[PDB]
Design a protein around this ligand. Structure first.
Ligand SMILES: *[C@@H]1O[C@H](CO)[C@@H](O[C@@H]2O[C@H](CO)[C@@H](O)[C@H](O[C@@H]3O[C@H](CO[C@H]4O[C@H](CO)[C@@H](O)[C@H](O)[C@@H]4O)[C@@H](O)[C@H](O[C@H]4O[C@H](CO)[C@@H](O)[C@H](O)[C@@H]4O)[C@@H]3O)[C@H]2NC(C)=O)[C@H](O)[C@H]1NC(C)=O
Ligand SMILES: *[C@@H]1O[C@H](CO)[C@@H](O[C@@H]2O[C@H](CO)[C@@H](O[C@@H]3O[C@H](CO[C@H]4O[C@H](CO)[C@@H](O)[C@H](O)[C@@H]4O)[C@@H](O)[C@H](O[C@H]4O[C@H](CO)[C@@H](O)[C@H](O)[C@@H]4O)[C@@H]3O)[C@H](O)[C@H]2NC(C)=O)[C@H](O)[C@H]1NC(C)=O
Ligand SMILES: *[C@@H]1O[C@H](CO)[C@@H](O[C@@H]2O[C@H](CO)[C@@H](O)[C@H](O)[C@H]2NC(C)=O)[C@H](O)[C@H]1NC(C)=O
Ligand SMILES: *[C@@H]1O[C@H](CO)[C@@H](O[C@@H]2O[C@H](CO)[C@@H](O)[C@H](O)[C@H]2NC(C)=O)[C@H](O)[C@H]1NC(C)=O
Ligand SMILES: CC(=O)N[C@@H]1[C@@H](O)[C@@H](O)[C@@H](CO)O[C@@H]1O
Ligand SMILES: CC(=O)N[C@@H]1[C@@H](O)[C@@H](O)[C@@H](CO)O[C@@H]1O
Ligand SMILES: CC(=O)N[C@@H]1[C@@H](O)[C@@H](O)[C@@H](CO)O[C@@H]1O
Ligand SMILES: CC(=O)N[C@@H]1[C@@H](O)[C@@H](O)[C@@H](CO)O[C@@H]1O
Ligand SMILES: CC(=O)N[C@@H]1[C@@H](O)[C@@H](O)[C@@H](CO)O[C@@H]1O
Ligand SMILES: *[C@@H]1O[C@H](CO)[C@@H](O)[C@H](O)[C@H]1NC(C)=O
Ligand SMILES: *[C@@H]1O[C@H](CO)[C@@H](O)[C@H](O)[C@H]1NC(C)=O
Ligand SMILES: *[C@@H]1O[C@H](CO)[C@@H](O)[C@H](O)[C@H]1NC(C)=O
Ligand SMILES: *[C@@H]1O[C@H](CO)[C@@H](O)[C@H](O)[C@H]1NC(C)=O
Ligand SMILES: *[C@H]1O[C@H](CO)[C@H](O)[C@H](O)[C@H]1NC(C)=O
Ligand SMILES: *[C@H]1O[C@H](CO)[C@H](O)[C@H](O)[C@H]1NC(C)=O
Ligand SMILES: *[C@H]1O[C@H](CO)[C@H](O)[C@H](O)[C@H]1NC(C)=O
Ligand SMILES: *[C@H]1O[C@H](CO)[C@H](O)[C@H](O)[C@H]1NC(C)=O
Ligand SMILES: [Ca+2]
Ligand SMILES: [Ca+2]
Ligand SMILES: [Ca+2]
Ligand SMILES: [Ca+2]
Ligand SMILES: [Ca+2]
Ligand SMILES: [Ca+2]
Ligand SMILES: [Ca+2]
Ligand SMILES: [Ca+2]
Ligand SMILES: [Ca+2]
Ligand SMILES: [Ca+2]
Ligand SMILES: [Ca+2]
Ligand SMILES: [Ca+2]
Ligand SMILES: [Ca+2]
Ligand SMILES: [Ca+2]
Ligand SMILES: [Ca+2]
Ligand SMILES: [Ca+2]
Lengths: 105, 1167, 5, 148
């Protein structure tokens, strides 16, 4: 019962790991939190795309004030989106490494 | 629908309560209070929870970088707080008052006059660049002072600007808090603030005292050390290793690895009792859990951390996995954390790590530059952990989460070899093996530790006895024993859903799904090795042992089996030549037999008839013994090298392996009669045997051909499992459920594969020394009956022995010297055919145990029977001590000669040390060496290496920080001098790493270089089937067998296509399935008339025929003349030229089909 | 070889 | 194997005479009687006399069963109270204790009891070799052969 391919893969691999049932339940909750994180990431990437569409329209228009406002919004939004992206990448690395370690031991 | 931010967006409700400001006005995170972070999670500055393993991993995770707030030590950066200045070129920082005091301060000496910079003590250009405050007289240039609460702003050089003094390391002892820029050193309850900076214990507590081991003895002294007193002397040549205390119990505990015991006493030293005395072979350290009245013990013979009640009851093991060399231990029951150090794990890394007090949620607290961490203590009020390093020679500190790493001492001139450590108020106390003293130092930073006590022996285990050292707190387990069935162990306060404790149960039991109740264990993996006999769960997740590890001091364990009705395990100590039995819980060790045992290689137990069988490699025989009456008999007498043995109580068979050159696996009735080979083709070294009880199939394993095979109990339906990746010398195996567990000698590991096919190799245990037999303990397996155990008539109506026989029958047997009378069920004594015998010959002394030892060993001072009888009541006028010993002259005690004049009084009368002469003379330490003050000689290069090689501290005496070494020596930066032999030797020795940095590992002779340049290995380890290089480059490119072929030195069997060594061809024994290796082309060997020709095809002297020795290795020279004296000495591919019907063989690379007329290609590849 | 140490 | 086991396996008794059992030994897997006869070991304490002396069932311990549904006859056994006094010998004992517990009961003729034993059998199962009674008239010292 998961919606993102990465969390499905991680759960599928962690099924065969040497996890205690307690650690398995805690890992399940952790994958739910990681799923929330990736949904936040893709939502804000799509928001970045829509802001890029507005920015493209503004730059085609060429208004300096519109360009400045859309820049203030867009560069900060891209910064935040990257902030979420690196966190998602790190969490994926942690979970995958832990599962792989728990498959061999 | 959704929450609306001030920006005007219906923001998803999931973005509220998530620590992230998801819209411009931050209203989504303005109100929502968040849940706390448990013990296994780290609190960020904003309250966010992250995994504990994310702290100090090298990545900023709290977006404040609070989880990476100074994980690296010695981060001076010339910054080092205001009022301080740094010597350029080193980064060392010195406060302002010391710079230009008239003497150099930093190791550079930049704080005084020098002509390189042209600097003199004086006020420079600061007279023009005045600040708002005092300028100063720094030689390099006038800098200016700052009042409290303010740094000098780097942009200004003139204005001091706010910061916090309350964060400076060492500003106040204990907690601090800042009042508008004024720091206040509040002290926790029970402490009185003094001098405005220091807090002292209130006189509501009975002063304080320091308890430490001076070496042999346990001493106690005041904080201002003047009144040392001996609290307990070590009896029987013991040594006090690690100490701890319980304040409210008035109790002090200590361990003793020379006597292999754990003791306890009161501070008056009167009431003394030994806590533990089984399976405590090397009790490295100790810790007291005062809240829950339990004792945490570190053991290093079998690396584990055990927790036990006071007075030594309710044993249970907490941590076993990857434990390597555990040395230090400490705990804080008020919070629920357990800290212990490790100077090298099974994975190699030395580390200091943290866990819950129940052993869960382990975490690498400190991992970089760790070295040899030897001791740990806790600052409970400040929530910091202190630990020492005996290899990089420092004392460092981190918080409970590992954030604020600070170093309090560094260098071989200060802390050459710390072992223990203890903390109290403003000071920290630590033993040192090189200074031979208990040291005293400031808890924050210090440059010259004062000697607190000086000892002539290596000291261990400092601790400070006080009430504030063990604060009061509530006990969750204090009510109803926590509700658990047997044992209640604390955990972190947030563990177990806020209950703060976890239920466990003693050895021989496991928890029910109710998780408070617990029931007996049903099955576990019993395995044996040289070090110990251990039992581990079959699941790989919960790795902790489930039985008390059996251990002996000179021991070497090989054989194992079990009796699940009594929950006991049988084992043979090949070093003692004794067979024991012992319960699961560790109690009840008893001797099964000790007579006529040369080398017992394997054990098996018939649980229905209660018979114990074992194979003797030295007697070349297998013996059966009944536990009910200790009677025994040899049932097979003239084997060559019997190794393994299994008995099938219901089927009534036994199976044993003989790996002498014509290797075979034999089957017999459980009586030992009807002996017959059942597997004698394609065998080399059949080390292990097993039975698949579900399918009734015999399993064996070869160490020559490295294959696992299984077959029916008749030897028919033989099958072979697939290749197992790295298996190259498998010794023992066992079958449980659908898996096969095998021990491998070359790997030194236990691997598990499927029993259906080759399986997926899973390494259960690794790096396990001289591993031996493995057996699956199983209470369910040992349920059954036969005509030997019917409830209505006992023992099958036999007198002494009853043996199951195939086809559901029984056969009676008799002990030695007794025969079955007419009845076939009752045994009558027959001394005529089997005369009664004595324990052993006239040349030796029979113990009171059944074992026999040489007469020279009697009264030599050391126990040789292991049931002390050769030293019992020696020294009487007529019973002399052996001339290798020394008699305590007033009579009644014979000590070994080695104990005479060894600076330790062993005799009851002290004669062993009385009248000892002086023996120095011209001790003549050669010119190539350094001479110690105790007249020992060591290599000159070992001087000033921060190691007490002289065993008196002389080679490290007067080892000031000189800045030079011996010319031959390599110098670690700011650490020590080291021998060049250790430079580029393979692993790290200096803290900065210079000794192993940048160098090239060009291999020696007979060594192979890995493809990645990781290391060099022996050429013997190349092309062996085991991966030795980390890149598997040692087994890459090795010669292989051509497809379907055999190597040029290997004859190919035409029946199956396997390969045998060429010397096995034309040897008289059919090694191939159909005997292709003994074709007519092989010429017979004719024996010179001076020799008899054996049935096995070998030559033996004419004189040795039926002489009473298995000279032909099959008794053919005996059985060819059992007439003995009755007196006293007083065409598909090839064609041949056979005489009759053709016997055409096929060419190599083909399989001769069962018709004997055609053959088929053997290669996988297609034509 | 195959001997026990 | 059938030699010396109290059974006339050869018909003429040649395999059961004492003259051969004076030197014959039982098989190692066989129980030996006090007199010397040889018996398969599954006959040891199985509620049958096989050794002649009943020495194959001497010294045995048998489970005393519940008073709910057990009748314990002389050799020791456990059979239901309903099973006694009926047409089937459930306590196979020495002496017909399964149905001898009903001496004066009535089974009508042509469904006649075995003479002096209340096991009820038809008029002609006699002079035939089937163990149709453990007492009295199994082979009938007076009448046989359907007698018309
Ligand atoms: C290696 O391991 C094998 C078993 O895998 C051993 O071979 C066996 O040796 C046993 C000797 O104890 C024998 O049981 C068996 O050999 C014979 O079995 C015969 C059964 O008769 C039928 O089968 C044979 C098969 O050859 C067939 O030819 C015959 O027509 C029947 O169909 C017995 O008749 C035979 O008796 C002969 O030998 C005995 C002495 O052993 C004499 O007393 C008899 O007069 C007669 O000559 C014999 O019992 C063997 N089975 C096989 C597979 O050959 C090897 O001994 C082992 N060798 C080593 C080096 O360890
Ligand atoms: C954790 O919590 C426990 C209580 O649960 C505290 O224990 C108390 O400790 C104090 C000392 O710090 C004790 O006070 C002293 O008691 C002495 C008599 O003790 C006897 O009787 C008690 C029962 O009442 C027994 O338990 C005990 O074993 C003894 O048999 C007094 O004689 C002392 O007074 C003397 O010294 C003081 C100065 O220290 C002088 O002012 C007096 O004039 C006199 O000379 C003193 O009063 C107290 O009794 C303990 N409580 C109990 C109930 O035993 C721990 O201190 C606490 N630990 C921490 C670190 O928090
Ligand atoms: C380990 O400790 C116990 C004491 O706790 C010893 O037990 C005693 O054993 C002897 C036999 O050796 C008995 O006669 C005593 O009665 C036992 N005492 C108790 C209290 O049970 C045991 O011997 C010790 N073993 C070793 C190796 O020291
Ligand atoms: C010679 O040495 C032995 C060993 O000490 C002594 O043997 C004693 O024998 C008696 C039985 O005869 C035992 O009860 C004692 O326990 C043994 N020991 C001692 C010291 O008495 C023997 O006594 C010694 N010779 C003499 C005459 O003392
Ligand atoms: C103040 C505090 O820590 N409060 C609680 C603590 O008791 C525990 O429930 C924790 C679990 O994550 O969360 C929070
Ligand atoms: C000096 C000397 O020979 N003393 C002897 C000793 O050799 C040995 O016989 C002993 C009993 O074992 O008793 C005495
Ligand atoms: C320049 C030089 O070698 N100087 C000295 C050397 O002679 C020796 O005293 C050494 C300590 O052993 O330290 C230094
Ligand atoms: C190979 C071979 O047969 N070798 C010979 C044999 O034939 C015979 O001569 C014998 C006499 O002692 O010596 C040998
Ligand atoms: C003691 C003894 O050898 N007894 C023998 C036994 O071995 C066997 O021959 C047996 C056959 O019935 O009869 C008898
Ligand atoms: C020092 O200079 C930097 C760069 O101009 C500035 O950002 C910082 O705020 C200055 N420090 C203070 C305390 O003003
Ligand atoms: C290894 O390398 C050094 C040069 O780097 C050389 O002088 C030395 O003789 C070599 N040693 C061996 C044992 O090959
Ligand atoms: C029936 O047998 C059981 C043992 O299985 C015994 O406990 C019980 O007492 C018996 N019933 C009666 C009525 O005694
Ligand atoms: C057992 O059997 C015989 C009849 O076959 C009988 O004569 C003997 O008395 C019996 N013993 C008892 C006590 O029933
Ligand atoms: C004596 O030796 C014989 C073998 O020669 C048996 O092992 C016997 O059991 C021995 N008995 C004793 C008491 O040592
Ligand atoms: C002790 O004295 C003896 C002579 O009595 C020898 O000289 C011996 O060398 C001395 N050793 C010491 C260390 O004084
Ligand atoms: C020991 O060797 C040293 C170095 O050669 C001296 O020669 C010394 O005199 C020697 N002394 C003895 C007793 O051999
Ligand atoms: C292994 O070596 C043989 C020669 O001994 C052949 O080269 C064979 O092709 C090799 N096998 C593989 C898989 O490389
Ligand atoms: Ca938010
Ligand atoms: Ca981090
Ligand atoms: Ca100075
Ligand atoms: Ca050191
Ligand atoms: Ca091998
Ligand atoms: Ca001795
Ligand atoms: Ca001594
Ligand atoms: Ca040294
Ligand atoms: Ca090195
Ligand atoms: Ca290798
Ligand atoms: Ca051969
Ligand atoms: Ca011989
Ligand atoms: Ca018969
Ligand atoms: Ca019977
Ligand atoms: Ca009936
Ligand atoms: Ca009849």
């Amino acid at each position: 019962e998961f919606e993102e391919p990465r969390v499905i893969d991680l759960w599928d691999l962690a099924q065969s790991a040497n996890f205690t049932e307690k650690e398995l339940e805690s890992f399940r909750e952790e994958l739910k939190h990681f799923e929330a994180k990736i949904e936040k990431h893709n939502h804000y990437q799509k928001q970045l795309e829509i802001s890029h569409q507005k920015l493209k329209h503004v730059e085609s228009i060429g208004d300096p004030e519109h360009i400045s406002r859309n820049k203030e919004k867009y560069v900060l939004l891209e910064e935040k989106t990257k902030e979420l992206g690196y966190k998602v990448k790190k969490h994926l690395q942690d979970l995958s490494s832990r599962v792989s370690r728990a498959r061999h031991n | 629908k959704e929450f609306e931010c001030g920006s005007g967006e219906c923001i998803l409700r999931a973005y509220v309560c998530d620590h992230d400001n998801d819209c411009e006005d931050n209203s989504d995170e303005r109100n929502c209070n968040y849940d706390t972070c448990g013990g296994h999670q780290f609190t960020c500055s904003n309250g966010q929870c992250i995994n504990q393993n994310w702290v100090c991993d090298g990545d900023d995770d709290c977006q404040d970088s609070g989880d990476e707030d100074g994980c690296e030590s010695n981060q001076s950066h010339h910054r080092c707080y205001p009022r301080e200045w740094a010597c350029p070129g080193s980064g060392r920082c010195i406060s302002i008052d010391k710079v230009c005091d008239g003497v150099p301060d930093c190791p550079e000496g930049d704080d005084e006059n020098n002509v390189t910079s042209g600097r003199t003590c004086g006020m420079g250009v600061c007279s023009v660049l005045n600040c708002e405050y005092q300028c100063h007289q720094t030689p390099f240039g006038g800098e200016c002072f700052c009042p409290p609460g303010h740094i000098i702003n780097s942009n200004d050089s003139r204005t001091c600007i706010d910061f916090d003094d309350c964060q400076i390391w060492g500003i106040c002892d204990q907690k601090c808090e800042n009042r508008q820029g004024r720091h206040q050193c509040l002290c926790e309850e029970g402490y009185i603030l003094e001098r405005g900076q220091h807090c002292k214990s209130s006189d509501s507590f009975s002063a304080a005292s320091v308890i430490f081991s001076n070496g042999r003895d346990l001493l106690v002294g005041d904080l201002h050390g003047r009144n040392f007193r001996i609290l307990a002397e070590s009896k029987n040549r013991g040594m006090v290793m690690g100490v701890d205390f319980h304040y409210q119990k008035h109790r002090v505990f200590w361990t003793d690895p020379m006597q292999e015991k754990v003791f306890s006493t009161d501070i008056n030293g009167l009431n003394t009792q030994e806590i533990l005395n089984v399976s405590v072979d090397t009790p490295e350290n100790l810790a007291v859990d005062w809240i829950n009245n339990k004792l945490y013990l570190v053991e290093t013979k079998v690396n584990r951390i055990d927790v036990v009640n006071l007075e030594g009851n309710q044993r249970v093991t907490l941590i076993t996995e990857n434990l390597g060399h555990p040395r230090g231990i400490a705990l804080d029951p008020t919070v629920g954390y357990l800290f212990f150090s490790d100077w090298g794990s099974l994975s190699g890394q030395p580390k200091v790590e943290r866990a819950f007090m129940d052993g869960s949620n382990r975490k690498d607290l400190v991992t970089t530059k760790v070295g040899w961490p030897a001791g740990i203590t806790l600052d409970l009020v400040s929530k910091r952990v202190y630990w020492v390093d005996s290899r990089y020679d420092y004392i460092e500190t981190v918080t409970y989460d590992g954030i604020q790493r600070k170093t309090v001492a560094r260098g071989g001139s200060l802390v050459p070899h710390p072992f223990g450590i203890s903390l109290f108020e403003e000071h920290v106390f630590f033993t040192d093996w090189t200074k031979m003293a208990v040291m005293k130092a400031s808890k924050f930073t210090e440059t010259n530790p004062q000697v607190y006590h000086q000892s002539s022996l290596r000291p261990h285990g400092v601790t400070v006895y006080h009430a504030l050292r063990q604060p009061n707190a509530t006990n969750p387990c204090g009510s109803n024993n926590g509700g658990c069935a047997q044992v209640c162990v604390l955990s972190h306060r947030t563990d177990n859903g806020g209950l703060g404790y976890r239920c466990k149960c003693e050895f021989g039991f496991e928890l029910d799904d109710d998780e408070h109740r617990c029931v007996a264990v049903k099955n576990f993996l019993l395995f044996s090795s040289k070090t110990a006999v251990r039992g581990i769960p079959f699941t790989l997740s919960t790795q902790e042992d489930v039985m008390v590890p059996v251990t002996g001091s000179p021991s070497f364990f090989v054989g194992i089996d079990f009796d699940a009705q009594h929950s006991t395990v049988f084992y043979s100590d090949l070093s003692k030549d004794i067979i024991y039995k012992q319960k699961i819980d560790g109690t009840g060790k008893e001797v099964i037999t000790a007579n006529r045992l040369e080398s017992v290689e394997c054990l098996t137990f018939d649980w229905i008839s209660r018979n114990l069988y074992w194979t003797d490699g030295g007697l070349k025989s297998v013996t059966v013994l009944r536990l009910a009456d200790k009677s025994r008999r040899q049932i097979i007498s003239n084997l060559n090298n019997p190794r393994s043995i299994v008995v099938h109580p219901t089927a009534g068979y036994m199976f044993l392996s003989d790996w002498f050159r014509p290797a075979k696996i034999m089957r017999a009735w459980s009586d030992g009669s009807h002996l017959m080979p059942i597997v004698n083709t394609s065998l080399g070294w059949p080390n292990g045997l097993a039975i698949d009880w579900s399918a009734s199939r015999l399993y064996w394993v070869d160490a020559f051909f490295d294959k696992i095979e299984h077959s029916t109990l008749d030897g028919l339906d033989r099958k072979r499992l697939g290749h197992v990746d790295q298996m190259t010398h498998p010794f023992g195996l066992t079958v449980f459920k659908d898996n096969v567990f095998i021990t491998d000698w070359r790997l030194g590991a236990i691997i598990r594969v499927r029993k259906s096919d080759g399986g997926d190799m899973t390494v259960i245990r690794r790096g396990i020394s001289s591993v031996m037999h493995v057996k699956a303990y199983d209470a369910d397996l040992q349920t059954g009956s036969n005509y030997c155990s019917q409830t209505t008539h006992a023992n099958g109506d036999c007198s002494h022995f009853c043996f199951p026989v195939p086809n559901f029958q029984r056969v009676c047997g008799c002990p030695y010297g007794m025969k079955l009378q007419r009845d076939q069920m009752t045994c009558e004594g027959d001394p005529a055919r089997e005369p009664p015998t004595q324990q052993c010959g006239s040349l030796s002394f029979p113990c009171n145990n059944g074992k026999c030892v040489p007469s020279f060993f009697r009264c030599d001072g050391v126990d040789d029977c292991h049931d002390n009888s050769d030293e019992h009541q020696c020294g009487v006028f007529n019973n002399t001590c052996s001339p290798s010993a020394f008699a305590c002259v007033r009579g009644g005690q014979c000590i070994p000669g080695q104990w005479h004049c060894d600076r330790q009084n062993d005799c009851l009368d002290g004669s062993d040390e009385q009248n000892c002469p002086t023996h120095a003379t011209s001790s003549t330490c050669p010119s190539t060496s350094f001479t110690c003050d105790n007249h020992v000689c060591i290599p000159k290069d070992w001087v000033c290496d921060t190691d007490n090689d002289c065993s008196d501290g002389s080679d490290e005496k007067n080892c000031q920080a000189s800045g030079t070494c011996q010319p031959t020596q390599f110098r670690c930066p700011d650490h020590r001098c080291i021998s060049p032999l250790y430079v580029c030797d393979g692993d790290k020795d200096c803290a900065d790493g210079s000794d192993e940095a940048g160098c090239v590992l060009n291999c020696t002779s007979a060594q192979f270089k890995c493809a990645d340049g990781s290391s060099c290995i022996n050429s013997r380890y190349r092309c062996d089937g085991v991966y030795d290089c980390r890149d598997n480059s040692d087994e890459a490119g090795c010669p292989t067998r051509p497809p379907g072929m055999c190597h040029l030195d290997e004859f190919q069997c035409q029946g199956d296509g396997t390969c045998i060594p060429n010397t096995w061809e034309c040897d008289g024994h059919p090694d191939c399935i159909h005997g292709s290796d003994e074709h007519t082309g092989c010429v017979p060997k004719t024996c010179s008339p001076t020799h008899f020709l054996c049935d096995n095809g070998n030559c033996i002297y004419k004189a040795w025929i039926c002489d009473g020795d298995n000279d032909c290795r099959d008794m053919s020279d005996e059985k060819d003349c059992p007439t003995q004296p009755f007196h006293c000495p007083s065409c598909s591919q090839k064609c041949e030229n056979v005489v009759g019907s053709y016997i055409c063989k096929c060419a190599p690379g083909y399989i001769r089909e069962p018709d004997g007329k055609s053959c088929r290609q053997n290669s996988n590849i297609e034509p | 070889x195959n001997x026990x140490x």
